[model samples]
Target: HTVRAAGAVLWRDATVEVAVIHRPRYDDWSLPKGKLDQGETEPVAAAREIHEETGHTAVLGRRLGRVTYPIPQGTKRVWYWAAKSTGGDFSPNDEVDKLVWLPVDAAMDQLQYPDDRKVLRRFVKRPVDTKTVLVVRHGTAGRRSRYKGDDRKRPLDKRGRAQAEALVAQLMAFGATTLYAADRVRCHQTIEPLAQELDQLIHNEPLLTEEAYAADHKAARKRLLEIAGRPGNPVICTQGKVIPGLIEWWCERAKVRPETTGNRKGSTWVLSLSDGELVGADYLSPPDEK
Candidate 1:
């Protein structure tokens, strides 16, 4: 058994400094983190915890890794992500009284626990200055066989609509600046909430649909890289059929194993790139709503 938690290695600027917070109760310096809220996913929790504890909004990037320590009930495991501070300021909260931005080396030395340092070590292993590209599978829809009309026109089922609404905050936590979707209506609906929240236009990718990918997978893959290289971090919603193959091609080119990734509907693949080369990939699962 385990208690799940999440946090971030919140950093800033081209020089790469991390945020360290002084916890008033424990009287120790550590990375900002807390146990997950009810029904909260790890990445969303990481962004939220960083904001609550350190008073900074985090634009989450790659996953750093998980750390564990024993508690009274069970193991307390915390997953950490490399996040950049987008906004906010500390105001002497009860949990954290002081916050300091320090270089990675200095932050490592200042952190109180070995587990926290382990997370930092993993964070520094990859290039900190990188761009994020989110590849998302469209939320659940009416089954192809169930819908009598054109499949292309089918809308999101009730659950899918809820899933799309939940994704707005989750995708925003990664600093999604551009929105894209496959030509399918379900795919378009998946990111519509985010597009509206960001007040951005949704660019349609005709090659990202299942029919298009079955015809020419390489073209779809090329389209993904093109979006990734764009100025701002993008969130692309495509069919499940395309995500696995696209991610497999990406992992192969990056020389990383695809064993840890999945393609559940409404899930996301957080791809991190440095200088147009894929360097990191993290999977964020679909929301489990009852």
Candidate 2:
């Protein structure tokens, strides 16, 4: 029997997404494998095939034994190895028509070989470790009088720009990624500095505007909650007013007096929210003293 070699399993965060190489001619999805060269070891061939097909740098983990199957001309034995993805992006060599990440249960159903399914089932019960998400609010923006014609077109004033730059520094310290903003000039202007610092784009969404603030508040809050609960590095930024209710609701719902601060703009007190809670409710500012 001719000997064939292969590698499988690129594990990450306690979950595994199988690299299924698609063959256009046969219209089949299968693990990456190729025949061994005259001087090549089975393990080396396995690693090379995996990199060629999956565009990932992986280290061999453990052996998953072997499977024998018939080829068009003769019988063949294929050795399999488990691997952990270390680095690199997925590479689609000409051999692989497509690549996909399939969860264990789904991968079992999709794998071409029955023996491969058995190997997949053995690792399916592992639990994925959760990641943290942090939500941030952008700093001040230009008020109505700061712009001409449309209010939505107002950009950040000088002070507002300074505040946004400071907020970007704070958010970077908090490890922010995946920025989302309302589709207003001010919102984009407010978050653009942060996005630049974080090397991310301000993922703009229109529903977070003040016009839809009341109607879409619930939906926006839900999205924030999902972002918070995700099991990866996540950071989101929104308007101060849009999610102010969340601080209030989180306090009332949790039956606790959320820590808060207040800044005085003239004689009126403005609340400051930070780290998912209100920070100041009685702080005074020069504008507030007026």
Candidate 3:
């Protein structure tokens, strides 16, 4: 069995320092984190573990990265985010005997695992504050042949609905403020749970739809760039055919090649932004896919 959990390379205040915890049980210095409870998403679990262990109510930022290593339980995997300490109190707990705030340079040495160091390196690559827009590929609607209504009107099937429901926790963790989708009902429904939870309406982007993108991709690119620049975390869910091309265009502009390049339904592309520029992108796999 594989042990999957979540944590963070959290920073304190308006500084470049990071948080490392001394686990009483393990007797090792590590990131403030632990195992994911049943049905918990990585983002949700990461924020929860940090709060429980460090007592910091964090503003979860971009997905920093993940680390995988061997453990007695099985192969252990941990996902991380860029967490900024917003506010909270810390009390000594069983899981963690002590907490230390160290500049990222020193924190690098204190972390127990070399793998954890790798996660830190990823964060330091771009440690400054950022705005984010969560780009999503719409969840799977029923097969086109199975639906009798207008192609754009096909709602999410039962399975897609489940994926949509599951996305609420992870989406909330990033502090989603605005929601957008293609003209298709499936695209809108995929983020409806999130919008409802955020008390926002799904903003429609006709240009993000496949047909619209095909008709004039340049216009789509302009609109997407605008979304990236807007303040706060804006989420956009679109069709499969459209998402990849959009990401590729961004990659060309950002001058970085992704480690991989597939958009699974129900998955999201968490793009880090600065002053309207795309600084980085991270893939948060679908709840079902991974």
Candidate 4:
């Protein structure tokens, strides 16, 4: 059996200082982390743990990766991300009585676990202050062949509804504020749960549809770039046909290849940008598939 947990290298400022907390119970300095509650996703767990331990809200960026170590009960697997501290106040708490934000080197030295140091090293390998833009493939609609109506109006199936529901926490984890969707029912339905939860309006993009991309991809790509350049980290729900081609073009220009495979329906591409240019991408498979 395995125990799952999540945390972040919570950072702030242009100089990239990280938060290392003094845990009174353990008598050691460590990064903010906690085990997942029942039905909680890793990214949400990471952000929640950061807030609880440090009293700071974090806008999570690229994933640093997972760290595993054995525990008395079982193997513990913790997923870590590079999270930028937005803002909040701290009061002395039971689990972490002291919270200190330090430069990378100092934070590394302060840490008691080598596992955390490695996660921090991975974070420093990339630009820490990059902006985020999420590209999501719409959740599974039933087969096109069986549908009697126009494909554009097709809705999500039972499993697809479950997948869309699961996406709420996963998308919220990265601090998605603005939302967009291809001009298709399935596309809209995929992110609908998230939209209602956030009470944010969904901007429809006719140019982002698979049909629109096939007509003139440059126009589609331009529209996507415009969405990415917006202030908030926007979530754009598109189609399978569009996501691969659109991301391929975007990645090519950005000169970064994705490390993950399978652009499955309901999956997502977490794009990291520096100065309005793509710098990194990490894939999140559909929740049900996981």
Candidate 5:
């Protein structure tokens, strides 16, 4: 079996520095990365591993792709993304002894592997100034049969609560400045923890719901433009039914083929838009289940 891991080609905009960690165990300097914990998703694992190895919080940007190599145990594969470090600090840790932040030219010069440079090269193609809109499916909710009341009113269950909490970290990695959700209870609840963490209001958009789309697709599309048109890298969480259709709609409109598929509960789609058009997108799985 292939051992899967994830991490990022982390950078900071201020000085445009890229992060590289020095692992004492291996006596090698490399991009920060670690294996996927049990059920962990890519972005969650990447964010967590970056924090663990480098002591810096990161927000993922573009998908740089993955690299594979042989390990003593078997083949190891690590997914990498373009990410910017937001906060936190580094000290001598058990696994990593030190961290270095360098520019791309020097970073490539100092890297330990050819595959890493390949990943970094892909990241370099992404326009640094483009906007990223995060389209997310709400966290897991109670079963339809179990919720006797209106289906829209069903709330997140125990596992879903944990997923919501973990999302604070996962979403933080991408630096979501604005939050939007379908008016449904579960959708709203999925981002409540993050809203509380950021002290921001979650904008409830009725058009983002499945029923709203079913009734008036034009209004739904208009609402989507409104959402994508507004400022910062926003995060919009909706139901499973709406999420896939929304992505397909964007793809059709822009005539862009997404490199990702499958919409799992709590998963996210990072829509890279430039000049009010969808240019690219990458899918990030939900945080690892508890």
Candidate 6:
């Protein structure tokens, strides 16, 4: 069997963070590609296919390369180019269950096909000129008694549930992918909704919490910076008592003092980190009625 597909090498930095279209049925990660439509050139087909799967407008760059492999019928050929994301949002409209930005190394780990990996390797470590990071606070949790035992075990309350839903909507608007939360129950509960929407789970690191163990907090903070430096993956931190220090560290690293504000409960802020500097912080109050 023979098949034809076209795709772009979407990247962020030296790392090749391609927009992967997932097919749940096959449980596979493949580039946004498909058979050529009537009168469609490979480049045109690649852009159209990507837009359909991810809802993003892309400008095709020079041909980074091609890959060939066997399919059910015979031999398949895939034409690919280095493309840039100009506009639009990601939407899982086709066989794609979700659209994700995975680092070349991570993608290499996740991809099932060896031939596809080789095609992706050509774009790895090219050079990322700009990067963006957005941090977020988790939603409210259920009553303390709900989880009983440790206060860390408490899940989000009804109000927290609602907030989680709202946060998911907001994050979708921002195109967030990589989400991290304190290992505590409340923080996980808060981020769960968004996690569901992303079809991915939150990465639990205890040191992200205020009660993080002595050495864990330091390690967690270091890990957070590493994630912030990555291309394609946008970091989202669920706020807790650790907020003050995290913000402070980010500010100091960025060489600027950010305007920080928070109420007693249920407050959230959006902090933007760019070029290893804290560019801006936007505070968002809880729902007016609440």
In angstroms, the error of model 5 at 147 is 3.8
Candidate 1 residue lDDT tens string, 103-206: 99999999999999999998998787778999999999979999989999999999999899999988988888999999999999999999889999999999
Q: Is candidate 1 or candidate 3 better by lDDT?
A: 1
What is residue 34's positional error in candidate 5, in angstroms? 1.7
lDDT per residue as tens, model 3, 1-290: 89988999878864577889998776899887778888777888999998999988886776766788888778888888888887896789868878999998999989898988988888888744777788898888878897887999998889899999998887878778999998889999999999889899888999999999999999999999887777678999998888888888897888855543568999888777767667777777887675
Cα miss at 211, model 2 (Å)?
A: 1.7
Kindly report which residue stretches of model 6 are placed more than 4 angstroms away from their true locations once superposed: 1-131, 142-147, 213-217, 233-235, 263-266, 287-290
Give the CA lDDT, 0 to 100, for residue 197 in model 1.
96
Tally clashes: model 1: 0
- Which digits, one per residue and each the tens of the lDDT, describe model 6 over residues 177-226? 77777777667776677788888877777667765634466776786777
Clashes by residue pair, model 1: none
Who is ahead in TM-score, 3 or 6?
3
Segments of candidate 3 deviating more than 4 angstroms:
none
Candidate 3 lDDT score at position 23: 86
* TM-score-superior candidate, 1 or 3: 1
Instruction: Please identify model 4 stretches exceeding 4 Å from their true place.
Output: none
> For this target, which candidate reaches the highest lDDT against the unseen true structure?
4
Alpha-carbon lDDT, every model: 0.88, 0.55, 0.84, 0.89, 0.83, 0.63
For each predicted model, how many residue pairs clash, with residues at least 3 apart or on different chains?
0, 18, 0, 0, 4, 14
What value of lDDT does candidate 4 attain over all alpha carbons? 0.89
Q: In model 1, where do residues sit more than 4 Å from their true spots?
A: none
The worst-scoring run of ten residues by lDDT in candidate 3 lies at 253-262
Candidate maximizing TM-score = 1
Tens digit of lDDT per residue, candidate 5, span 1-290?
68999989888876578888888787887988889887677777898988888888877777777899999898999988777777898988888998888888988888889998898787776554467888888888978987789998999999888888888877877778899999999988989999998999999998889889888878877887888888888889898878777789888988877776778888888888777777777887777532
Q: What is the lDDT of candidate 6?
A: 0.63
Q: What is every candidate's alpha-carbon RMSD to the true fold?
A: 1.6, 19.2, 1.8, 2.1, 2.9, 15.9
Candidate 2: where is the Cα deviation over 4 Å?
1-135, 231-233, 262-290
Q: State every prediction's TM-score relative to the real structure.
A: 0.95, 0.43, 0.93, 0.91, 0.85, 0.50
